[PDB]
Enzyme design. Structure first.
Site, PDB file in Angstrom:
ATOM      1  N   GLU A  61      63.659  59.044  10.893  1.00  0.00           N
ATOM      2  CA  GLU A  61      63.854  57.840  11.712  1.00  0.00           C
ATOM      3  C   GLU A  61      64.099  56.646  10.797  1.00  0.00           C
ATOM      4  O   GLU A  61      63.531  56.559   9.727  1.00  0.00           O
ATOM      5  CB  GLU A  61      62.614  57.581  12.592  1.00  0.00           C
ATOM      6  CG  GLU A  61      62.759  56.367  13.521  1.00  0.00           C
ATOM      7  CD  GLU A  61      63.916  56.511  14.489  1.00  0.00           C
ATOM      8  OE1 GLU A  61      63.729  57.119  15.545  1.00  0.00           O
ATOM      9  OE2 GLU A  61      65.036  56.038  14.199  1.00  0.00           O
ATOM     10  N   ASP A  89      61.944  62.540  14.021  1.00  0.00           N
ATOM     11  CA  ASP A  89      61.417  61.415  13.282  1.00  0.00           C
ATOM     12  C   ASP A  89      60.967  61.677  11.858  1.00  0.00           C
ATOM     13  O   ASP A  89      61.230  60.845  10.980  1.00  0.00           O
ATOM     14  CB  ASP A  89      60.297  60.777  14.060  1.00  0.00           C
ATOM     15  CG  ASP A  89      60.792  60.110  15.324  1.00  0.00           C
ATOM     16  OD1 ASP A  89      61.899  59.536  15.324  1.00  0.00           O
ATOM     17  OD2 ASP A  89      60.041  60.146  16.291  1.00  0.00           O
ATOM     18  N   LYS A 115      59.553  63.873  26.629  1.00  0.00           N
ATOM     19  CA  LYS A 115      59.985  64.174  25.275  1.00  0.00           C
ATOM     20  C   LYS A 115      60.200  65.680  25.066  1.00  0.00           C
ATOM     21  O   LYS A 115      61.207  66.096  24.476  1.00  0.00           O
ATOM     22  CB  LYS A 115      58.961  63.602  24.290  1.00  0.00           C
ATOM     23  CG  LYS A 115      59.481  63.370  22.900  1.00  0.00           C
ATOM     24  CD  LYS A 115      60.473  62.212  22.833  1.00  0.00           C
ATOM     25  CE  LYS A 115      59.821  60.878  22.532  1.00  0.00           C
ATOM     26  NZ  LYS A 115      60.878  59.939  22.055  1.00  0.00           N
TER      27      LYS A 115
HETATM   28 MN    MN Z   1      60.484  59.141  18.095  1.00  0.00          MN
HETATM   29 MN    MN Z   2      63.673  59.146  16.369  1.00  0.00          MN
END
Ligand code: MN
Ligand code: MN
Length: 178
Positions: A61, A89, A115
């Site tokens: 990320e 991430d 998610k």
């Molecule tokens: Mn995330």
């Molecule tokens: Mn992300």
């Protein structure tokens, strides 16, 4: 809220958040709750990556798309871990799994399922934080030690409290959409 964000988060995080918003045609000065949320998410990701042994995590990320995928593809090639459909991430070198981090203004279980539904991965670990001290991780495996998690949870609580003192929290808290 724009002023709050600029004094709360460090300049690197603010720059990345501005860039991410403008890439979707969104103005950080107008969609200020979104600006705040993106910054919070980035801050959590960087905190999480700092919480292990040196070299435990690779940050994905916050990287430009080309570099992010270069990192992901490199890891996949050298470890044989399945290639995710979307950028995660972090990668955890200890547990050998990608990590998806979430920070929610609603509730951790609903955000977790959304998610899980989005990424549709058998292998990527999900870890969700709230601003009121809840967390929820895949298979109740929270990856980091209590101390590191506590630091993240305390930071988010502190952000919440600061927003509240400025009468920004109630708009912010109600700004996340399914
Ligand atoms: Mn995330
Ligand atoms: Mn992300």
């Amino acid at each position: 809220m724009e002023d709050f964000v600029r004094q709360c988060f460090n300049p690197m995080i603010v720059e990345l958040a501005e860039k991410a918003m403008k890439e979707y045609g969104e103005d950080p000065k107008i969609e200020t709750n979104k600006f705040a949320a993106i910054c919070t998410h980035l801050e959590v990701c960087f905190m999480y990556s700092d919480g292990g042994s040196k070299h435990r995590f690779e940050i994905i990320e916050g990287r430009d798309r080309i570099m992010a995928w270069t990192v992901v593809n490199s890891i996949c090639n050298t470890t044989g871990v399945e290639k995710p459909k979307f950028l995660p991430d972090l990668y955890d070198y200890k547990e050998n799994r990608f990590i998806e981090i979430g920070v929610t203004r609603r509730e951790v279980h609903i955000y977790y399922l959304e998610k899980a539904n989005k990424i549709k991965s058998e292998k990527t670990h999900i870890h969700i934080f709230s601003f009121t001290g809840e967390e929820m991780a895949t298979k109740a495996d929270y990856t980091l030690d209590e101390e590191s998690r506590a630091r993240i949870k305390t930071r988010l609580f502190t952000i919440r409290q600061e927003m509240a003192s400025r009468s920004l929290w109630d708009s912010f808290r109600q700004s996340e959409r399914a």
